[PDB]
Write a protein that binds this ligand. Structure first.
Ligand SMILES: Nc1ncnc2c1ncn2[C@@H]1O[C@H](COP(=O)(O)OP(=O)(O)OP(=O)(O)O)[C@@H](O)[C@H]1O
Ligand SMILES: Nc1ncnc2c1ncn2[C@@H]1O[C@H](COP(=O)(O)OP(=O)(O)OP(=O)(O)O)[C@@H](O)[C@H]1O
Ligand code: NA
Ligand code: NA
Lengths: 50, 224, 220, 228
RNA sequence: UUGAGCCUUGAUGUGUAGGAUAGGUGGGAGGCUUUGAAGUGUGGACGCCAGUCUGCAUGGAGCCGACCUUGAAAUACCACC
């Protein structure tokens, strides 16, 4: 529907991303969640991308 | 085509302006010497002149912001002055939103409705009013100041330079809005068609004599 | 006379040889002067780009033929070491505001990183002419004693114009022809060594040794 | 000899111009027009490369010069008139500010040693030693008198303020994204003046003004951005 | 007839402030001039209109340069563009 797909690309430098959905009409700003990066095995920040 | 119309609140009857002698000059030869003036409740008084002769400094001291070496400007008994400055950027600050910024300007209307309609009448969609009022651009900055005088209902108007960023359709709406306006306004515009069609009583500024009045501005140039 | 007779005698349509060029260069002898003859090499770069610029200094085996009044604007121990190198200045701003204000100029500028005084003292007068030694060119270096000897040794400086062509002093007529050839080879090799990395196309196209008061002849 | 490329932008709900795909080049001046509050100013703001779009179609030409007059004609009441014109050269301005922290620095560091030399050699390479004089002749050439060269921009009439801001844009650049709505300078005399300057200059320029007559005399192509 | 590229030569290109319509790099301050000059009158062309400019003999052999306000020096000179 109105909810489209984004990917949260990690900030640890490695290429890893959690893919989710986000409604843009209500909120046009980015998403920032501290998630787990299996490449470096640590909890790092995941800024929205794509 | 935004739909704007200005309506009065008390409608003074005899006259508005009273200027005896202005003699205001910043750091050079004074831009005007005396400028005896009277408005007489109407007389849309298009101030004119080439840029750099001080038509905006005349209006700024005509409203009482810049103190002149004059002897006061003597507004009427119940004048409600509405100002649309040539530069308008101090108003759009402190990161109020579109709905927030518009809301404080009112006297009797309600806060939720009757200000959404006025703000939304001039082409502001539902999702356009939930963003900061400083991020607006150009005509929307101008369109706010037209809406600002909607609810204020200024009995006497100024409109320093109204047709600046408007998109050739708001100009047709603004030209129509001031045409049926009842009351007094003292504007200075630079284009010809806006001044020509809109009612006028010319006061051109050239060094040193300030020529006053020739009628329609279709006759002011015809006299040349 | 000479400027209208050197034109027909020496033709620019044909490209000459190195050995002949030095011989014809001294062949003129029309103008009695020091005649510091020189060469302008058409470097192939895009001077519009800031990464293709060539700006450095090199030393010739025989020298420039003249000692530059290398004032040392390096306050501290550099002045003590540079006092025995033959410098006409000490490390301070004294030779830049009163000495360098009404004074005309020095020959070269020796810089000391420990003193940020002569950097602004020259300003639009001592720097507007380009006399300020670039930090990467060795004019302003961590030390002052080593550079002073090399500066007097004939550390020639070369920069591109707006087009990207380089010409700097190589020697005088008083130097014998064999000396000049080695001096020319010293410039070309260091110029070729310092040629940048984003330099598409052929680098050296035209090389033309010229007289101070005469003409210039193509070499290759 | 180069051209520009495509972009796509959105500041929230209902994205604005949705996969634009255009090219600007040659000598023709694309007059860009559009209704209020729809692309235009922010479309070519993206083109300047200072801010990047959301969908990111990208439009690159990083070799030649871009000079941009903007809509905020009062964005500098502080800088003196000579400083605003010099600041039109972005590389020169940013270099000078970090260079100018010499007399404001009472103590110098070791790493500052060659840093001040590194900035100064860049200053001379792009010949900032004439920027004040180079602008002055140009600034005098657009009609600004000498006596106000060193004065602040706060004390300059807005009609005059466009003549300074156009001189800032004209800094030897073979394209200009002109946000010039000749708002204050509508003397007809000054309007007729600005029509000669742009017409007799060969550049792949863009003009955005709402003046129907002004777009006739100058622009050759139009790039209306109306529906989507 | 008209566009586009290439070679060759010659011309060509200030306000701020001056003796002057000085493009950039600085090698240098002595070249230039009678392989006919200073100034004189005589004609193009160009010209943010003062002037560059070169066919012109006669007149016939001194002009330039350094200095001087300048961000910068100077058709004084040649070359590489
Ligand atoms: N604060 C000030 N200090 C010094 N001079 C000023 C100041 N304000 C205005 N001036 C000068 O006095 C005159 C008044 O110009 P002003 O700013 O009032 O606009 P204006 O002449 O009406 O111009 P426009 O038609 O372009 O809007 C101008 O010549 C301006 O340069
Ligand atoms: N920072 C921002 N983030 C998101 N959306 C924005 C932002 N700034 C502006 N917008 C939106 O983009 C619209 C277009 O603004 P823009 O600056 O492009 O004006 P414009 O259409 O060129 O107007 P004018 O012709 O009056 O200059 C605004 O009305 C606003 O809704
Ligand atoms: Na004004
Ligand atoms: Na805009």
């Amino acid at each position: 529907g109105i909810r489209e797909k984004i990917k949260l690309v990690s900030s640890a430098g490695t290429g890893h991303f959690y893919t989710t959905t986000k409604n843009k009409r209500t909120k046009p700003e980015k998403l920032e969640l501290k998630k787990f990066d299996p490449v470096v095995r640590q909890h790092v920040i995941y800024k929205e991308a794509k | 085509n935004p739909f704007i119309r200005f309506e009065q609140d008390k409608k003074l009857f005899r006259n508005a302006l009273e200027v005896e002698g202005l003699t205001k000059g910043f750091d050079n030869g004074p831009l005007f010497k005396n400028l005896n003036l009277l408005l007489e409740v109407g007389e849309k008084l298009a101030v004119l002149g080439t840029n750099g002769v001080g038509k905006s400094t005349l209006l700024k001291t005509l409203v009482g912001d810049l103190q002149p070496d004059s002897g006061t400007v003597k507004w009427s008994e119940n004048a409600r002055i509405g100002y649309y400055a040539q530069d308008h950027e101090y108003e759009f600050e402190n990161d109020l939103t579109v709905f927030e910024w518009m809301s404080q300007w009112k006297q009797e209307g309600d806060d939720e409705q009757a200000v959404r309609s006025i703000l939304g009448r001039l082409l502001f969609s539902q999702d356009d009013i939930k963003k900061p009022a400083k991020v607006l651009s150009g005509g929307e900055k101008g369109r706010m100041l037209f809406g600002k005088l909607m609810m204020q209902k200024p009995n006497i108007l100024i409109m320093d330079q109204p047709t600046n960023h408007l998109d050739m359709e708001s100009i047709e709406s603004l030209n129509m809005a001031l045409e049926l306006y009842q009351g007094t306004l003292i504007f200075v515009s630079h284009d010809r068609e806006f001044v020509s069609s809109l009612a006028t009583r010319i006061l051109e500024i050239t060094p040193e004599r300030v020529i006053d009045f020739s009628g329609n501005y279709e006759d002011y140039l015809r006299s040349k | 006379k000479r400027m209208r007779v050197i034109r027909e005698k020496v033709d620019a349509t044909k490209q000459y040889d190195i050995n002949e060029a030095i011989a014809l260069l001294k062949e003129l002898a029309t103008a009695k002067f020091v005649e510091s003859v020189d060469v302008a090499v058409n470097l192939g770069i895009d001077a519009r780009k800031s990464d293709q610029n060539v700006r450095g200094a090199t030393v010739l085996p025989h020298g420039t033929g003249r000692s530059v009044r290398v004032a040392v604007f390096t306050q501290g121990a550099n002045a003590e070491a540079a006092k025995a190198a033959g410098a006409e200045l000490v490390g301070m701003e004294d030779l830049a505001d009163q000495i360098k204000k009404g004074e005309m100029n020095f020959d070269v500028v020796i810089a000391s990183p420990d003193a940020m005084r002569v950097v602004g003292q020259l300003g639009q007068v001592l720097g507007p002419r380009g006399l300020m030694p670039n930090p990467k060119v060795g004019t302003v270096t961590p030390n002052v004693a080593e550079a002073v000897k090399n500066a007097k040794a004939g550390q020639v400086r070369y920069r591109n114009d707006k087009n990207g062509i380089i010409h700097t002093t190589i020697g005088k007529v008083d130097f014998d022809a064999d000396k000049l050839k080695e001096n020319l080879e010293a410039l070309l090799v260091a110029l070729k060594k310092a040629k940048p990395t984003q330099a598409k196309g052929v680098y050296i196209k035209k090389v033309s040794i010229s007289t101070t008061m005469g003409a210039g002849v193509a070499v290759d | 000899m180069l051209v520009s490329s495509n972009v796509t932008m959105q500041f929230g709900s209902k994205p604005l111009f949705e996969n634009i795909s255009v090219k600007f080049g040659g000598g023709n001046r694309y007059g860009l027009i559009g209704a209020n509050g729809s692309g235009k100013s922010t479309f070519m703001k993206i083109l300047g490369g200072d801010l990047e779009p959301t969908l990111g179609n990208v439009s690159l030409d990083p070799n030649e010069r871009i000079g941009k007059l903007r809509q905020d004609q009062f964005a500098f009441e502080e800088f003196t008139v000579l400083d605003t014109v010099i600041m039109g050269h972005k590389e020169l301005w940013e270099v000078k500010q970090e260079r100018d922290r010499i007399y404001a620095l009472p103590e110098m560091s070791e790493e500052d040693g060659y840093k001040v030399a590194d900035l100064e050699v860049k200053y001379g390479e792009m010949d900032g030693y004439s920027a004040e004089a180079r602008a002055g002749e140009l600034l005098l050439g657009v009609g600004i008198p000498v006596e106000q060269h060193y004065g602040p921009m706060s004390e300059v009439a807005p009609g005059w303020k466009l003549r300074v801001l156009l001189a800032q844009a004209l800094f030897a650049d073979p394209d200009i994204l002109l946000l010039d709505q000749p708002t204050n300078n509508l003397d007809i005399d000054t309007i007729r003046w600005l029509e000669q300057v742009l017409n007799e200059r060969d550049s792949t320029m863009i003009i955005i003004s709402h003046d129907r007559h002004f777009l006739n005399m100058v622009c050759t192509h139009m790039a209306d951005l109306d529906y989507g």
